[PDB]
């Protein structure tokens, strides 16, 4: 009916007027490119050959445009159409049209998209305004859009099959509007939380943590190789930190050349002892924690997500607020390039040896688990003998569940702390967690020590069968194993009942995600 | 032992599962009876006398790993991965390219992907035998390094060796089949397969009609680029209208088979199959058997890839940052077990709940073959030759090529076709 035509999503009002399918748009898969700048995006040649931008023929660009017209649609840097003053669109694709190849001022050559063009880049859903940002085109081989990795976080993009839409402005007026209101360097700091949207991420973050340690010493050739990738370099090699016996620079000394202008910042590394600030060695910091950047020079410290990440007061945020958005763009790009080449030198990996712990650590974990299971048994016996008394506001069932949960969670935490004590400096799980690039201490603990309690709907694994969780367990078993506790680590391997209970927990998480999307989307539409 | 010995001689002993059921050894139990039955996961561990948990077991599981389905049964060491990752691997293993059936030549099915060189996994679950994964495998074992090499493996992407790709690694064939039926609707209006003529047929296109044969159907073995005319069909106009089928844009294939038959109605019906050989590009999507996928970030030649002392360069480099948050330790255990199996010559056993295959045992086995216990290896940087300071985890892991390829997804629009009702750009 006429009402159904106009009514809902896919109706005229919302599906055709508020939003509509548009021309000059391209969608393809995204892949990483550390070599591109923040604002640069990588466009395949075919996408760039289909999409066109109309350029008014002027006396100063008539020669170049006539060359482009001569090349035509076939040769890539060419023109698809010529729009006359009358509005007649001579077609360069179909037949030479030798008389109609002439250009005069006022004609519009629909040239192909070239390097330096400003394009909007979008990922769905556009939750915030950083999801649509203006990028400067660079044409690279192969068929994927290629974007810098600092720009992945605003788009919420990972290169695992994601695709991104590209919209090309068709006028100089709208091109200037896009360039000024929406360029990526202008979007670094969000108004939502007055923090940078983008920061150093993934390999570069871990490699920055490793690079800025006190131990890192770089010889002359490595220093020159890394300065080759610093675009803002003044061409002067800093005097090495260690002149004799052999000239050796430091990772901090070279990172000081990345930091632009004269930027002052004080942060603290994630593994900063709380005692250090109160006690002596405040400004010496035996662990080389803390971070002090004076006059744009990294005097002391190790950088992590707290210094180079998306948080208020970070070195990135201070650079944006002090030096400007263009210099901050250069800052991001230079960090990524020189630290990625040093990472080519040092290297990074994850293996089984990272998951393995000491034999003593495994013994301590086992002892903690035994003690916890024994305490749970004692609590169950107290409840059975009716010695247990209800906690105010809770039933006897609820207070028993809370006590058992507390025992199991404390044992889980103690096993996790033992596993984390086991970790060496060389451990790569620890490296990624300390840098903040990926992972958490929870993940390390589950990998090495204990997966933990599997809980569904905020309670331990329910008695789905008649008065028992699985048929293998006896009826009325409230012990840790029966109700879902997984004492084996991922490396050790879950036992079959633990496997099923872990599947129950994972299923709950997946259901939560899937259900969440729609409710949040409705809320966002209503607010807007 | 009598039943197991007779089943072991199964053929030429005429003893089968039904005889096992008839003997009363095994029994079928449904969920309602599962509610009233005490089960033991394993006979030795549970039935045998110990500190008595239960002394009234009424049944025993044949093997725990059977709780998994068909797609989750291919996951090696699934008990060492996070639970959502096994769901992801089930979903992705439904999407891996392999030889789907042996009669794929006879079938003319639209959108058929078949891999050049499928391999059976070096680390395999026992239940795979009953899924026929050995007979019709999907994916290739590949030397994989878990390393951060040039930043092109960051996020979830994957660096690949271009030389290996050039030697046949993950090369596939995509067959697209087109169907066209000549039919008569009006008594004077009929559709005929014929090569359209510029003058005789009113509707025509710039697209080349020369490749069409006399019958109006392209012969097999002819290269057909995008928008060329596969089938030439003309309709008498009560001069003629062109209803000829064209290739899907950017198909760029070679005709494989052209079959001409009569359908149920008796009208002539033609099916034409087009081969497009798809080599891995830097947008194609590859996934391990552990629920972590990724597009190809870049392809480096064998000279550029990092190399070990023995001269081995990884076929695939995956970012280490994938492992920690996802906690897919089964991936690392599968690399270690694959290294052990490839050096030993056996095929590794990754059944979910073996309890006889620890990681420590695999490490001790790998130590005997001259490698580091934990599988790390000293890698030399391909570009400069200097040893990489951090020893890198390398091993043979089974990887699958998912059907999602960049060439199928790349799209662009500029003043193209427009819908009639909305007069807005079209969809798709």
């Amino acid at each position: 009916s006429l009402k159904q035509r106009l009514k809902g999503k896919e109706g005229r009002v919302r599906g055709n007027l508020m939003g509509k399918r548009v021309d000059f748009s391209a969608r393809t898969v995204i892949t990483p490119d550390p070599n591109l700048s923040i604002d640069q995006v990588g466009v395949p040649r075919s996408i760039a050959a289909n999409m066109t931008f109309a350029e008014i023929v002027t006396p100063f660009n008539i020669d170049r445009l006539q060359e482009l017209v001569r090349r035509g649609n076939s040769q890539y840097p060419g023109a698809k159409y010529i729009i006359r003053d009358n509005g007649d669109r001579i077609d360069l694709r179909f037949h030479p049209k030798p008389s109609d190849l002439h250009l005069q001022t006022g004609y519009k050559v629909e040239r192909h998209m070239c390097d330096g063009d400003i394009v909007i880049f979008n990922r769905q859903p556009t939750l915030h305004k950083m999801s649509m940002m203006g990028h400067r085109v660079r044409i690279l081989p192969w068929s994927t859009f290629r974007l810098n990795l600092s720009v992945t976080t605003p788009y919420n993009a990972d290169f695992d099959g994601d695709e991104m839409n590209l919209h090309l402005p068709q006028s100089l007026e709208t091109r200037a509007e896009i360039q000024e209101l929406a360029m990526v360097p202008r979007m670094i700091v969000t108004p939502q939380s007055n923090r940078p949207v983008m920061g150093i991420v993934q390999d570069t973050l871990t490699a920055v943590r490793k690079f800025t340690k006190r131990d890192v010493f770089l010889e002359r050739g490595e220093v020159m190789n890394l300065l080759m990738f610093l675009s803002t370099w003044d061409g002067k090699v800093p005097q090495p930190a260690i002149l004799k016996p052999r000239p050796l620079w430091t990772g901090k000394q070279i990172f000081s050349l990345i930091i632009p202008g004269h930027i002052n910042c004080i942060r603290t590394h994630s593994t900063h002892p709380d005692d250090e600030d109160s006690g002596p060695y405040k400004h010496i910091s035996p662990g080389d924690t803390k971070v002090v950047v004076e006059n744009g020079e990294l005097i002391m410290g190790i950088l992590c997500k707290k210094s180079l990440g998306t948080s208020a007061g970070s070195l990135v945020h201070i650079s944006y607020l002090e030096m400007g958005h263009d210099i901050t763009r250069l800052f991001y790009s230079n960090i990524q390039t020189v630290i990625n080449n040093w990472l080519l030198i040092e290297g990074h990996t994850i293996g089984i040896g990272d998951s393995i712990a000491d034999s003593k650590t495994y013994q301590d974990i086992q002892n903690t688990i035994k003690k916890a299971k024994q305490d749970v048994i004692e609590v169950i016996e107290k409840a059975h003998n009716n010695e247990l008394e209800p906690t105010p506001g809770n039933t006897l069932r609820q207070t028993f569940e809370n006590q058992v949960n507390r025992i199991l969670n404390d044992a889980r935490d103690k096993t996790g702390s033992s596993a984390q004590k086991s970790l060496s400096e060389y451990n790569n799980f620890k490296s990624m967690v300390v840098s903040g690039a990926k992972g958490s201490k929870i993940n390390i603990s589950q990998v090495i020590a204990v997966v933990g309690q599997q809980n569904v709907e905020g309670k331990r694994i329910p008695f789905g069968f008649k008065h028992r969780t699985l048929p293998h367990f006896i009826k009325d078993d409230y012990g840790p194993e029966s109700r879902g506790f997984v004492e084996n680590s991922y490396l050790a391997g879950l036992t079959p009942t633990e496997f099923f209970f872990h599947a129950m927990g994972g299923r709950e998480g997946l259901i939560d995600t899937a259900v969440k999307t729609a409710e949040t989307g409705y809320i966002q539409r209503r607010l807007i | 032992k009598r039943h197991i010995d007779q089943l072991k001689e199964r053929e030429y002993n005429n003893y089968s599962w039904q005889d096992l059921v008839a003997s009363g050894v095994v029994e079928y139990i449904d969920t309602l009876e599962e509610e009233t039955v005490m089960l033991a996961m394993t006979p030795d561990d549970l039935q045998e006398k110990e500190v008595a948990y239960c002394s009234t077991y009424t049944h025993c599981e044949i093997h725990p790993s059977m709780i998994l389905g068909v797609c989750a049964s291919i996951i090696p060491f699934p008990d060492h991965n996070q639970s959502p990752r096994n769901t992801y691997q089930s979903a992705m293993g439904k999407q891996a390219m392999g030889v789907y059936i042996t009669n794929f030549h006879v079938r003319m099915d639209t959108l058929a992907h078949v891999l050049y060189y499928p391999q059976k996994p070096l680390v395999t679950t026992r239940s795979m035998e009953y899924l026929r994964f050995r007979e019709l495998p999907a994916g290739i074992n590949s030397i994989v390094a878990i390393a951060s090499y040039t930043g092109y493996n960051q996020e979830d992407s994957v660096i690949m060796n271009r030389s290996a790709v050039d030697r046949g690694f993950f090369r596939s064939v995509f067959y697209r089949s087109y169907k066209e039926q000549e039919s008569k609707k009006g008594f004077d209006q009929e559709e005929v397969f014929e090569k359209p003529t510029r003058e005789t047929c009113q509707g025509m296109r710039h697209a080349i009609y020369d490749k069409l044969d006399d019958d109006g159907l392209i012969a097999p073995g002819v290269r057909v680029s995008g928008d060329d005319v596969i089938i030439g069909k003309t309709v008498t106009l009560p001069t003629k209208r062109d209803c000829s089928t064209f290739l899907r844009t950017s198909e760029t294939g070679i005709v494989d088979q052209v079959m001409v038959t009569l359908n149920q109605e008796g009208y002539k019906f033609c099916k034409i199959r087009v081969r497009s050989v798809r080599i891995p590009q830097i947008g194609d999507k590859f996934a391990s058997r552990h629920g972590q996928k990724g597009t190809c970030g870049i392809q480096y030649r064998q000279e550029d890839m990092p190399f070990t002392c023995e001269g081995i360069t990884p076929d695939i480099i995956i970012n280490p940052h994938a492992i920690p948050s996802r906690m897919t330790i089964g991936h690392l255990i599968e690399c270690l077990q694959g290294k052990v199996s490839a050096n030993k010559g056996e095929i590794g056993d990754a059944t979910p709940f073996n309890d006889a295959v620890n990681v420590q045992k695999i490490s001790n086995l790998l130590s005997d073959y001259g490698y580091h216990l934990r599988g790390n290896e000293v890698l030399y940087n391909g570009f400069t030759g200097r040893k990489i300071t951090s020893q890198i985890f390398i091993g043979p892991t089974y990887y699958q090529r998912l059907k999602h390829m960049v060439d199928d997804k790349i799209h662009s629009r500029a003043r193209g076709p427009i819908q009639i009702l909305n007069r807005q750009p079209m969809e798709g």
Binding site: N405, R412, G452 | -
Partner: peptide
Amino acid sequence: IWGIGCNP
């Protein structure tokens, strides 16, 4: 999958 206070 961790605990009651964590995640499932």
